[PDB]
Design a protein around this ligand. Structure first.
Ligand SMILES: Cc1ncc(C[n+]2csc(CCOP(=O)(O)OP(=O)(O)O)c2C)c(N)n1
Ligand SMILES: Cc1ncc(C[n+]2csc(CCOP(=O)(O)OP(=O)(O)O)c2C)c(N)n1
Ligand SMILES: [K+]
Ligand SMILES: [K+]
Ligand SMILES: [Mn+2]
Ligand SMILES: [Mn+2]
Lengths: 329, 359, 362, 329
């Protein structure tokens, strides 16, 4: 059975709506339009105006209503049409949601989910290409996940809805239509993927390559290519950005002695920076036979013209090149 | 022998998009009069004590007081049910008490001790209680939150309403207008409440000061915020309106706060001190209720002096609990970051410092 | 022999807090009629061509077309001076043309080429020109920007005004309300203009706005609702709004009732939330160009023959510009890093790994 | 003689207002109130309503109005009462200001300054304590600075006002009242500190200690204590967050072989992560005899109670401890 990332997320939301009438979905065009990228297709027809709510274009406002609905015990899924637009609402995400259970001394939980596509699209230019993983990962009181394939997406959405604290689910527009095979245990309405756990997507012994979201597939094509020359990459899909699963990255590095991180976001203070600093401060530092190095988006607002954009996002080539510098081959 | 109840006149409200407002006349039973009087006094004394402990530096960071505005928190509470919901900004000590927190847990939160309602974790601006959502430090942010709580009331189908408070300075926050629009579109039972005390720190800032009309398409009424019975009737009327399914409404409360006018221009601050003294002597909320209860033979002058004495005692017991109580211990720094999760570690100031976090 | 001008009756505007509105008759000279007609037809063929380039994959990402709304951008331009300032959102092609850019530069931008107005750096949504500030992709963000441009007008004291445009979906942005209050407080010469084409993506005005009287949303700010399919109405209401701001009375709201023939953008077919027959009635009774055509023919300002010739000229011209834009080379990779900062010495920007460096010059 | 950080910022604004009539100041309480924290004291009396503009509490709105005024050729200083409140307006800083020169192909510059206090203060709890250096530092199109002492403060607001691009100036509330010795050249109207250059505040040979804002002074206290046991710290004051002066940090580490970073903000994806990523990627990596490590804010929303807050911000003892671990003594 092949299922696209978009359908995986949709199945996840459907199952959770069915399981718990406190769950509802709100955002721009989620209802009668069937979703801006069709993620919420069919949901309004099935659950009605009460559960699936089309909002005005008032991000701060509806993100805040959603947070308020969660404080009162409901369990909203608040969609941002892309994460670029959550900047107008980021006050509500951080100060009304992330910090509250703490400020209240554990009296006030906020079981809200924020979801939407994140990072780079194709030709949408600087205001619509921004990756927010490091921004949100920075904040205590949040959990932040960034799924890659269909399993990841369905299991993390469901974990997110089930969690009782604010969770930011950073999806990816270019992944929505990619089909994957979907083992019968993902098809289950009980399929959960725990937050805070990375997955090894490909065993290897020469180098550890860590990524999240769409570039994970690029690390897999790079590993397939390097493999024909005898170089075996252990490719790690982070899944969770906060709290990240560093332990799995450490065990891999003690085996391979080499680390390259790969991410689509801007480089400075980005996700790879944090993995490198951790690797350097943790028990695996000494096992490192070469500097940990970072593959990232180029450090520019995203340009429009095709050839500029291609050179603004990491490509398979760039991953391979960093891998070869690192293994000194 | 005392009168069992009496009738009083209350300012007519100015209306926006309403043909009738709340009555201009109302009935106070002596029992209610006594309860409202104790409550306003308790808040007055609590805030005077906090001001004292703040100036002694025992309370830190912020300490916004609401003395002068007691008719608001006590009147609003008089017009709603324990099962209704209330959210406001940072000047929340009165509301925290009228929603059922003790003076103990409030002052001990203020002095940062383990016995605070938030365990010393929140301080002045962040206190929570049953159906009271704070206590919110980002001006304007509570208005959408309240609209959401109202959405939850509509969704639960239990006929409860949400009172959502913001001050005059907050009234030009964009998110208030986003909320007004969604509230009206979805017919949320949200009562939008502007506490108008004439200052937003220190019409320099608002093109219109007709706060009750700012919802435009949402109806609104302007209420005398210094008269506890007047607030009570308006609130009764406003909650009736929401429960009946007609969607949101605005209530502007015209009130005044005695504290937080630390202007540094000497002309302006001199004038502001005169004004404080005029308002206090002509429209003090508690004094207004007292004059009425004595004058209609609802209670005796000495009967209220007795109440003052019990209240001074409650507050004194609470102050000394709040100054003797231990601070929360260090090993609880990382507690309550997440709800319902298993224990985990949190990093301190360097990697060798680890705090356990439990839910 | 043609008449040199004629008088037309124009729809009376609805008023919010105004004792009198724009006049309900106005004078059109033949020269202006010819000019307005050509400009509207140019915008129309420009957008039809952009559609076709998009379907061919020559234009990527976002592409929002303004056909059906030509009376707005041409009407607005005709009631202001070149020294006035205008800002809008992303449905900006007509504005960028009416505001001075050529069709070559506009199409070359959309096809991502080096001859584009930003050399391919911005694409559909981000074009600038002299006194034209985009071309802004974040809904509502442009309104406080317009309120600030207006602040600069008052600050420099030259009597210029600023037209600040937003759509009906954007009318529910909190920041629009923050700008109202500030502009009224400082009496900013800002004309707030709500382009009401009845939808905000796929969401009908009734379903996202509790009150669909956009011209009254500014409350204490006065406003006027205007027929946005009639270019002479837009011209007059603008002329009135500009004069109102230029006289120091502060800001004013102007709602243009108009219609978009295309979906929200190229991926949206624009038929799931409204009927094909609704589009057809609007094209048929209210097309901005045909309403203009009829006025000049029935009042002898110009002949049917003459306006066909314009049509044919313009269509060949868009064909030439399009060939230019499709054949024009992409910007060179070397320039990836250019124009990060204004007026700085050159520096280096990191590419997708540390071994990749791009020169950045101002 | 002595001048407070506050009065130094105030001198720079004054001078810049005087020098260029296109420069102006807006935000909450900047004029008649004399500044929320009295930094603008006397500006309004001296310059009037036209140049010193009190705004309503409408952050996204006045922020965008400032950006607009900038696009039209004025040179606004836009004050956030604290940076926590800049979250409401952060879309204007990033998407309207930072990216616009690039998106316009170099046609539209945006000479705007965002300033005000950032990070931890005393007792103000979690919604009022956030540090934003790593958030803003992440964004291409922005310059971001972070002054510690009076000379930093005055030189850097002056350079910022002189720059033609958006500059975020992250000030610090607790430093406002601190007096410093003020050399006659800082008193000059021509005094400028270049954005992009760090400063060695103390020469040393055993370890390099890098910080920004308030903790710089704690690094110096730590250094004096360690000096008494024959341990000589080279303390570096960053001054600029973006673009950070990494060459200066490199040459120091090649001399001292050890690196500790110290910041007040949250640890994950923070300023120290970037500095360590860079150090490991760069030429100084081979000169490191011990892993570089980070001293930071504790990873929690800021607690209110004193003893908790005291242990949520780096103290001299946590700096000295991390140094001693790093040198193994
Ligand atoms: C978004 C935001 N901006 C600024 C502040 C700083 N600030 C705190 S209180 C205040 C005045 C607000 O006054 P008002 O709403 O009239 O309430 P009051 O104190 O009078 O009850 C300001 C500007 C804040 N807390 N949040
Ligand atoms: C802040 C923000 N939220 C959401 C979006 C996604 N979005 C882009 S356009 C749009 C519809 C806006 O419609 P309207 O203002 O009526 O303008 P129109 O296209 O009709 O001219 C939406 C929701 C965005 N670009 N920015
Ligand atoms: K959840
Ligand atoms: K500047
Ligand atoms: Mn107030
Ligand atoms: Mn529209």
């Amino acid at each position: 059975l092949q299922v696209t990332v978009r359908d995986a997320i949709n199945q996840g939301m459907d199952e959770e709506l069915e399981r718990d009438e406190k769950v509802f979905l709100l955002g721009e065009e989620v209802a009668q339009y069937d979703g801006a990228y069709k993620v919420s297709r069919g949901l309004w027809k099935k659950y009605g105006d009460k559960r699936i709510i089309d909002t005005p274009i008032s991000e701060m406002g509806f993100a805040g209503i959603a947070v308020g609905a969660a404080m009162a015990g409901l369990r909203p899924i608040c969609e941002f049409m892309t994460f670029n637009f959550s900047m107008q609402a980021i006050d509500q995400v951080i100060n009304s949601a992330a910090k509250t259970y703490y400020m209240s001394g554990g009296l006030q939980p906020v079981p809200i989910v924020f979801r939407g596509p994140n990072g780079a699209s194709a030709g949408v230019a600087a205001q619509h290409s921004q990756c927010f993983a490091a921004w949100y990962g920075h904040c205590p009181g949040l959990k932040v996940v960034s799924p890659w394939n269909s399993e990841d997406a369905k299991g993390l959405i469901k974990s997110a809805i089930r969690d009782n604290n604010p969770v930011v689910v950073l999806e990816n527009e270019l992944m929505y239509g990619v089909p994957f095979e979907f083992p019968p245990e993902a098809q289950s309405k009980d399929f959960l993927i725990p937050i805070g756990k990375a997955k090894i997507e490909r065993q290897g012994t020469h180098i550890t390559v860590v990524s999240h979201s769409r570039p994970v597939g690029h690390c897999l094509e790079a590993a397939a290519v390097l493999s024909k020359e005898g170089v075996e990459c252990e490719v790690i899909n982070m899944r969770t950005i906060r709290p990240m699963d560093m332990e799995t990255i450490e065990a891999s590095v003690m085996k391979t002695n080499h680390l390259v991180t790969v991410e689509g976001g801007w480089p400075q203070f980005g996700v790879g920076a944090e993995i490198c600093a951790r690797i350097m401060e943790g028990p695996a530092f000494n096992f490192l036979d070469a500097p940990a190095v970072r593959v990232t988006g180029a450090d520019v607002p995203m340009p429009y013209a095709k050839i500029l954009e291609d050179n603004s996002i990491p490509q398979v080539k760039d991953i391979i090149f960093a891998i070869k510098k690192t293994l000194n081959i | 022998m005392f009168a069992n109840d009496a009738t009083f006149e209350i300012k007519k409200c100015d209306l926006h998009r309403l043909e009738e407002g709340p009555p201009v006349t109302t009935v106070l039973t002596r029992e209610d009069g006594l309860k409202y009087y104790r409550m306003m006094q308790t808040v007055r004394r609590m805030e005077l004590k906090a001001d004292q402990l703040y100036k002694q530096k025992i309370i830190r960071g912020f300490c916004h007081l609401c003395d002068g505005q007691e008719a608001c928190c006590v009147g609003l509470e008089a017009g709603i049910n324990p099962t209704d919901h209330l959210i406001t900004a940072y000047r929340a000590h009165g509301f925290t008490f009228t929603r059922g927190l003790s003076v103990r847990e409030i002052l001990a939160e203020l002095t940062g001790r383990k016995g605070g309602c938030a365990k010393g974790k929140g301080g002045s601006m962040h206190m929570y209680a049953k159906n009271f959502y704070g206590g919110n430090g980002i001006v304007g942010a509570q208005v959408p939150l309240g609209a959401g709580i109202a959405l939850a009331c509509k969704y639960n189908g239990k006929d409860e309403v949400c009172l959502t408070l913001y001050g005059d300075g907050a009234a030009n926050q964009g998110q208030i207008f986003e909320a007004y629009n969604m509230a009206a579109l979805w017919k949320l039972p949200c009562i939008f409440i502007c506490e108008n005390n004439r200052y937003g720190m220190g019409e320099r800032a608002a093109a219109s000061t007709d706060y009750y009309k700012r919802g435009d398409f949402i109806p609104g009424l302007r209420v005398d915020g210094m008269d506890i019975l007047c607030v009570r009737e308006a609130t009764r009327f406003a909650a009736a309106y929401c429960r009946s399914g007609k969607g949101p409404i605005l209530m502007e409360l015209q009130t005044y706060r005695y504290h937080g006018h630390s202007m540094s221009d000497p002309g302006v601050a001199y004038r502001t001190r005169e004004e404080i003294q005029e308002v206090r002597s002509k429209s003090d909320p508690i004094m207004l209720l007292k004059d009425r209860m004595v004058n209609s033979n609802l209670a005796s002058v000495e009967e209220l002096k007795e109440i003052d004495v019990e209240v001074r005692k409650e507050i004194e017991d609470a102050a000394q609990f709040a100054t003797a109580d231990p601070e929360p211990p260090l090993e609880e720094l990382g507690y309550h970051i997440y709800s319902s999760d298993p224990p985990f570690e949190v990093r301190g100031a360097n990697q060798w410092i680890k705090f356990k976090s439990v839910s």
